[PDB]
Symmetry: D3
Subunit: 306 residues, 6 copies
């Protein structure tokens, strides 16, 4: 149980006991879905310390998400960054996942959010076993969802919002119920957008391709991989991608804070390339894990020591 645990949660300005982090059922966000959250990793680094990965960019996006919804957050970025470090430190955590969430309180329950408190909470918990290059060598099997990805003037897709993930859950459940590892979603035009919670990449003829920044979230892992790709001399192309363009690709993979860099060996029971992790995916995977493990000089400023 996530609720019944010893530990500390940061809530509305103070560290409180984990179990005391509670709200009433007539909370606006529970009923109407307007809330925003982040997903952030901390890694044990090669020198023995713990560092949060791209803390600044994640916290900037968190506040930008609230700003999209015109949610006045009673804390600045500097405060929230320190608070996230606090949560990791006081829970005696090393390799872990941080979940900041900002939501709308229980003062009034009309559609209008006007007059409700804007709450902020930050919790963290241990990550599972470290996978790395060795643990993420076998690709996963993906299914194209029959549910369509968010429309960009119905949902604000640059916001990492609570309400958006009903779509993700429906897509993810469709895939796993028929034995697949994850879903891949097409946008309203039938072009590949992203996974249920991950951005999508393919490789063809030594070049890295990814859907243009249209209906998908502006992933921080996505941005990380694109930067590492260019730095390694690999050309990156953003374009509209069809599903059969994926079927015929040399390699493919997912990126996300939780997913890191995860190879896709199969889509809709079409084997991707040779069916193993491809060489470009491997290269980017190693560049990625070198960065998050603090074995990279070029990107030291992406790690925040606890």
């Amino acid at each position: 149980s996530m609720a019944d645990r010893d530990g500390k949660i940061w809530m509305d300005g103070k560290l409180i006991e984990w179990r005391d982090a509670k709200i009433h059922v007539l909370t606006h966000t529970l009923h109407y879905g307007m809330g925003v959250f982040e997903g952030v990793r901390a890694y044990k680094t090669a020198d023995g310390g713990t560092a949060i990965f791209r803390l600044k960019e994640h916290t900037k996006r968190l506040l930008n998400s609230a700003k999209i919804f015109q949610m006045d957050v009673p804390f600045d970025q500097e405060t929230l960054e320190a608070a996230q470090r606090d949560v990791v430190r006081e829970n005696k955590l090393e390799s872990c996942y941080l979940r900041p969430i900002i939501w709308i309180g229980s003062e009034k329950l009309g559609v209008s959010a006007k007059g409700n408190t804007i709450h902020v909470a930050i919790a963290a918990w241990p990550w599972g076993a470290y996978l790395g290059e060795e643990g993420l060598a076998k690709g996963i099997r993906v299914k194209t969802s029959s549910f369509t990805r968010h429309h960009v003037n119905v949902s604000m897709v640059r916001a990492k919002a609570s309400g958006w993930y009903v779509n993700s859950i429906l897509a993810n459940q469709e895939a796993t119920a028929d034995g697949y590892d994850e879903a891949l979603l097409l946008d309203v035009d039938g072009y590949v957008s992203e996974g249920s919670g991950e951005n999508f990449f393919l490789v063809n003829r030594g070049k890295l391709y990814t859907p243009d920044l249209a209906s998908c979230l502006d992933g921080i892992t996505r941005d990380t991989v694109i930067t590492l790709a260019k730095e390694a001399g690999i050309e990156v192309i953003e374009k509209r991608i069809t599903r059969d363009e994926v079927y015929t690709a040399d390699e493919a993979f997912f990126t996300g804070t939780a997913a890191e860099v995860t190879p896709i060996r199969e889509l809709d029971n079409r084997t991707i390339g040779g069916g193993a992790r491809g060489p470009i995916t491997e290269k980017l995977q190693s560049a990625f894990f070198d960065v998050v493990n603090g074995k990279s000089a070029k990107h030291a400023d992406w790690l925040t020591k606890i």
Copy 2:
């Protein structure tokens, strides 16, 4: 405050004290938006009694919403109907708004959503006219939103789901920030769909028009008004409606449990007809209120005495 009140809330099989109806901040629905709810009204009827309006139909829709999401609800329809009546009775309410809500608990916080408790809670409180008393009698000013209504293969629009209402909030806030009473949303094709929390009707040449049951919710108030219109010998036509078709209509109005029957006297600063409450609207509105107040011989079974 909705949290800080005296009274009883029905939750997971029993009446608890109002303030005790709490959840952890790591509740699945708070983060990922998959929950379902209903809006139901109890009315003080002409005989001095209290009666819930179309309880069965609302409870049926609540379980169907959960069914669409494959959420297993640990209570059947008969139990939930009785629970709603219990809430109204034990809180000694003469008239109220009921809010049943079904959500996903705090046992685990992945998108993968497996193994979480399916919670159910029912609260009720006194709540006046959603769009105001002056609105009911004189009509309101409405603004066509620049936010687009839900796409039917992205959101499951037949389910009244928590996550869906980010879109309603964005639209409603856009309208009210510029001084309008409510928003009207167009679907992805540019046709009138509905209000942020209301089904939409217009009147033209003595006939009642409403958008076909496409991108909009299958409103129970909507269904009520259509039945009353047919019983009054008024022809009802379901079609695709353009915004300038509304600009030139004889009358227009909103329907919903909270909004009841609210006239629209103006859309996008274009006066609707004569600019007041039109004769067919007033006719349907009065017929509606005669039903909920228990003054009609034809629809007694739409009312459940407490």
Copy 3:
């Protein structure tokens, strides 16, 4: 040259000599397309008199077109109805086409549209069969346009507006350039909408079909024919029509004030039915001309004597 004529034109409150009806080249509507107009016919009736067909309905739509654009017209409906009768009378026309137009003057030439005079002019001239006397009896050859019909949230399709007809010109010119009589336009979804300046009907298995009132103008001739069809015991169905649904139709025809009721005997070089004017088209065509010629007692109220 329709500028160089003898006669009277009603302009801004009074009858003036035809040639004096002039405007400056820095007229707002000339540059920015926002103006509204009507097409109205006066017929020689069987009693030797002249009557305008559905004057009230056309003048109502004209003012509603202005209302859609929030153009404040300096004259009421009674005044404009009389003025149109005045124009027919003072030009000694036994039968004619009336062109009322409302436009935005030359006081200021920004998009700001603020403070310009709202002008109104009415001219009239003899005008025979828009698509030919032969076309009326034998039917015409139509080409589906490669230009798409107006989107209903880009253009306000219920307004008969100046700026809309660029689309009609492009479609019409495409058809006639390759030797066809008229163009047929599909909407943004690829369903049949209407002709470049006519509503569309088809007949199949003794029933009359027409596109639903979606992206097409609410034609008065369209309404006229629908009514006459119902009165003739013919079932009328409004639906989304595909182009190959027309190819395989028993009959098809156009309606409009200029086009009256014009049979379509061929679409995209597919012969419609037998290839001439079909029986149900002929019955509806004859019912139509009986009405405008004042041989029909049931619809005398549709005719206004000069």
Copy 4:
């Protein structure tokens, strides 16, 4: 009044008196919207002279607009360039605005433009005070319109045509009626296209972004700014932009002949960046005004001395 002035207007081959530039009300373009126009600025340059900005490019676009409509213009580019200079010179103008317009005459008033004279007129009038960098230091407040931008197979959006601006007026009136400075329009897919009469740019992470050349007009100010940006070493990216991508941008601005380079400090009541003019926008403003004032070494060929 634009009509009642002393001056000279070039019309159909020669300078005539301003007030004599008249046409009949039965002019085809007044009724049907197919006409094309340009907006061109002349600036007082640093050496005391007066020069038209990108006259050749504007006149090329004027003739291309007519060519798109298959309007045979009875004058070549060289003649029209000389006439525009003639109009500035003979009206004794310095800083001013030129308005060339090509339209369809009054020989026949069917939807068919066949047989009608193709007219050309050029007028010009003084500009208000020079704003420059200092005068355009305040960003404006923009509202996303509830009206959708032109469909590229319904309207020919590369043509600057009379009929297109009904949509612009509707969007602009919607914004200004609620107290905003200008409208921003989304295309039929919900992506930012442009302002009602201006192209749109945003800045993020030191890079310049703009909607790809899809549903928007190929603005000459847009082209000017893109070129200056590249010459200043600024990366220019063309992509599909969402409205919340604007909400979260560092800077944004409009470009247009009249608007020059105008910063945007707010969209839909979301503050853009810090709410002031950004450093990139200022740099591009400076480069732009250095060019139009004739103080640029690289782009003298963009100015035509009167």
Copy 5:
């Protein structure tokens, strides 16, 4: 094998031995997909005889399919009807499936189809329940496909054309590969259109619902069922249907010549109603089989004895 068997096939005017009905690999339709076919059943009637169900309507549609493609068929409807009867007779079949097919021959292999032979062949064989015999009585499990149903201005969906069924194969293969019985396809807007080879119906609150005749084939079984429904006093409604509208329907079923009337007990692992063949479905299914077996006098003219 379908090729290797004893019997007779009608091909291009004459009955030939089954195995002799061959064509060259360089056959136009084989490479370019433009061919048309039909599915027709003969049943063993209750009097011992054999009758083809709705031969006239199927043969009319066959020629209309050809007409849509402008394929000149060298045989009239009378001849093809007789040919089909001969095929059933000369193969001594008491009950069977007829497959007429019209295709473009091997004279030329450019895209430009001109100058090729238009071939016609008619074969027949005994064929059981298309979706299984157990499915007819107990209902089948259906999966919403991730492939989108034909666009009505890309494909001519009223023609039963060879090339259209790549889409059907892709959807059907997707469903069967994961253990479902058949696929359900949504149109380009996300609404339920039809199965991969079946029209679709749902039942709710005593009424019969089916997608409007938009992107789906004008099914003859669909038409049969609608007629029988109306004759049974069951109200029939054509509308746009969402997938979650199916999830919450009382009943659902497929119709087609091969599939006859097939109940749907489950869609996307959501149980439909009580999870069995519903009462209305049962009533319409029995009405259907009574008609095709010649046990109903009302529709004798739908049967053609061999």
Copy 6:
């Protein structure tokens, strides 16, 4: 006749006599459209020899097309490449058009392709310029089709599939029936996609434009021309292109195996630039024919000697 010829056809593993390459009319692909094919040319090279142009890429794409449809091809790429060379050699062809085709056999004729034999055949014949020799030199006249290009989630557009060409035939017939040389198709959004059997390019201000790889085939000739353009120092830009963007372009041309590099001098009766073959088109066309004729050392590896 394509059937009645002397020579050898490679079919299912061996060369057979041309006329013996036969299939049964009850072949799955003939009825349901799922098959894939290629177009490949052998050129008489400058040394008097004969070479297939980019045999590897075409054969790679052939198998990728099969892979998209999950068609298990009983031969590998090495075998198919050698077979194509065999067909040219044994037929004693100096230059020719090669047509490899993979289709689904005649074991079963249900929608389900499981489990029919996957057949492969390869024929070759002399074939001149697809769009004419004069067309290659002076450019052709093109008409924009009123038929819309394939939707990327209805058809798998990266597969060169038999079923896809009903659309091409319909577009191409529409163009030629009215005296044009070829059709140009817009995608479902109104943007230019490609010819009926050709990729599309335009030239503007020294730069080369082509629609992005979205709804069109990933043509190999397209790829070749892009590569040659970059080697010649010409910038290549991929973007969304409107039809009026073509109207106003400096040059335009088609590419394809059959069509080679064919200039377009006219679209929709708008002259493209000078009305003749433009300089950039001539340079690229010349560079192309240099490569396929074996006159260029840079791309010898694209040629496979028979």
